[PDB]
């Protein structure tokens, strides 16, 4: 650190000429003080992009944590410097870095009200659901400080990702149902065919939502798909009733998504939902209620003749 | 008075306004961090107290620093130092010399430096320290 | 219990006439002793199906646990009485009931070497992966006591279910990859089209394995599908290399499945694997290695002209 | 309410007529003998005619409601000389974003005035086309930047052949 504090003073003061001469003399770029503050940290805190650029040209550490846990990305997000946030992310800065409080840079940018920083951070995969030591998400810090547009963006993104996961879940339940109905002790081929058709339709619904999210410039974020509630359904009637309950749940979440889109003043999302999703749900619920009442009138489940003939005449 | 025509009454205002002064090449607050004599107004404002003092008697077994108010004040200090609003190695000389030049706008001081600021001829004023979480400072 | 011990003596001794007269007098069927032993428990321990049948006709409790945790299904599985196991399962006996040791009835039937009980229990959804207080699965208890055919059945079932889950996993990775390549900052349409095609092919592979498992009379058992490792792939080259690594993993698990099938003397499974799976894996690995070497020779990823022209000429 | 809605629809008609003339300028820039890119020119002529159709649809709507069409001058585009394919694609993206923003203000005004027919007209014929156009133009910009344009003349030639061809 023979020229390391000579880099610290120029990083505090912002002289491109001084750091150019120090790199002409080969000054060390990883000069850490007693508390871990690097020349890159002061370059970020100051807001001069050129010293940051040349520090990264000579191989400064992009993810150097101090004694408090802050990286240059943290300080850049605090003070609202967009270009250095962009070039730090361009050089492999960890977007979900936690400090001593567990606060990611997205927490800071949502707490202080910087839109463009929030959007660039969301583009690189910042976690929407990260909680700090108090159990606060960035959505909570944005509503507590009156940054309502940030909270709108953060709420809509989470809601669309949950709808994608919910459509992927329903396809797997139908797969389970379909392969229950061609076991050799449940020999109903048209039930199995019907539920395989529903499985593929739900896969298409999820893919449509993914395409929509890519057209808007939002960030798809996938989660686990959990296993269905049963491996063993019990009859055709019971499986039809479970399918009706499932489609009603999906319709309810779609209505909540539409109300959220109407609060956020997004007419394109509202028209997308009511054109491709809201009428199909109504049709499906009408058809499944039809199937349930006909099966109950014929005398199922305690009549094995009823499910055989329903298999032949309605599903055939 | 020139750098700030309207002083703030909350310490919670000091970080935000500091974001303004770095936009002018200035610093918000710079004082002697090497003494508890300077820092005790903030940390002991909302529950800290050196010794319990009642009826003209100082209780020796009742040294109050393990209190929630002292915790809150010291966390506010580490928030002012972590985000680099101030420096940790600063002291009285750099603070007063920079304020005489007019680089830092706020300082905390007793009477002994008043005439020194009267050497600067800076149009300055003196007021009470801001309150913190409703509990005022305790010099 | 004025006739409850009169039911206990006939349950210990096995008189259909005595219990017929006691039900003509309306004897209570839920007569619990000081340790919880019901008339159904002794009826199961004894092995006379008629007293069990009439006890269930008068509404005896099928899932009555004693002070040690045993139900009638536990004792029936211990002593090797097939018909009463069947009719208990037919009346809603819980197939995954744990005792004080955490040992399910499948643990007992595997520990003692009763094949038909094991198979009827597997038909009703017995958990293959249940561990007792020592961390022993029924497969472990079957190998520790020399019941090698039980262990063969238990091992093959688990292996086919894991291959089903692994094919479902790979389809979701390809879905992620496909929708990465039509983001507005990754504008490569033919990459996205290619990876959607692979996603649907893997869905078909999983469905073929499910159909095979239903033809053999085995029990499909579905698990969670976990999220892919990345949301953000980095280039066409990096995604092609990840896809190659994935297909090599799938091929390795298929080879282990084939070796297991050859140890179990199952020529039909061996021919199924090598006819529908082993040549497709070789073709896919050859094609993906082709893509990787051509992309590396053209100069990708650090040439944006290379991936554009690969998109046009090879994937077009 | 009546006076505000009328003015807003007339301004949207003039704004659609403006955008058609910018695309005409762009199209005939790309077939100068020192800018010999035929598929760029063909693309921008197509956009010019589409915007003419958008304006005519708004005029037909205004005649069905019994409102008064009122036409103004159409001002000349900002440039006669665009600079490359990349620069013209970026200007076209900026233009379509401006048009989309004015359409969103028109929709909010229609929702304040309790006019469901105007709201459904806007979101059925205008709001999805804008989203499609913005997605396609951003695609073109990122591909042209990755290929190495404008300082690579090989990039714009091959983009002309393979994407616009």
Numbering used by the authors:
A (entry chain A), C (entry chain V): 35 to 350
B (entry chain B): 140 to 278
D (entry chain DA): 186 to 350
Quoted passage from the original study:
In this study, we present a novel DARPin–apoferritin scaffold, with a larger size of around 1 MDa and higher octahedral symmetry, meticulously engineered for the binding and imaging of small target proteins via cryo-EM. Our most efficacious constructs, namely models 4 and 6c, feature a designed ankyrin-repeat protein (DARPin) rigidly linked to an octahedral human apoferritin via a helical linker. The 24-subunit apoferritin framework allows the attachment of up to 24 target proteins without steric hindrance, an extraordinary feature. The modular design of our scaffold allows the adaptation of new DARPins through minor amino-acid-sequence modifications, enabling the binding and visualization of a diverse array of proteins.
We selected MBP (45 kDa) as a new target, given its larger size. However, the MBP-bound DARPin–apoferritin complex did not achieve the desired 24-mer structures, likely because of the strong interaction between the DARPin and apoferritin, as well as between neighboring DARPin molecules, similar to as observed in the GFP-model 6c complex. Comparative analysis revealed that model 4 exhibited significantly more 24-mer structures than model 6c. The ample space between the DARPin and apoferritin in model 4 allows the DARPin to undergo conformational changes upon binding to the target protein. This characteristic led us to choose model 4 with an anti-MBP DARPin for effective binding (see Section S2). After initial data processing, a significant number of particles were selected for 3D analysis based on their 2D class averages. The initial 3D reconstruction, performed using cryoSPARC 3.3.2 and targeting the symmetric core of the scaffold with octahedral (O) symmetry, yielded an overall resolution of 2.69 Å, revealing distinct amino-acid side-chain features [Fig. 4(a)]. The C-terminal domain (CTD) of MBP was well defined, with the side contacting the DARPin showing higher resolution than the outward-facing side.
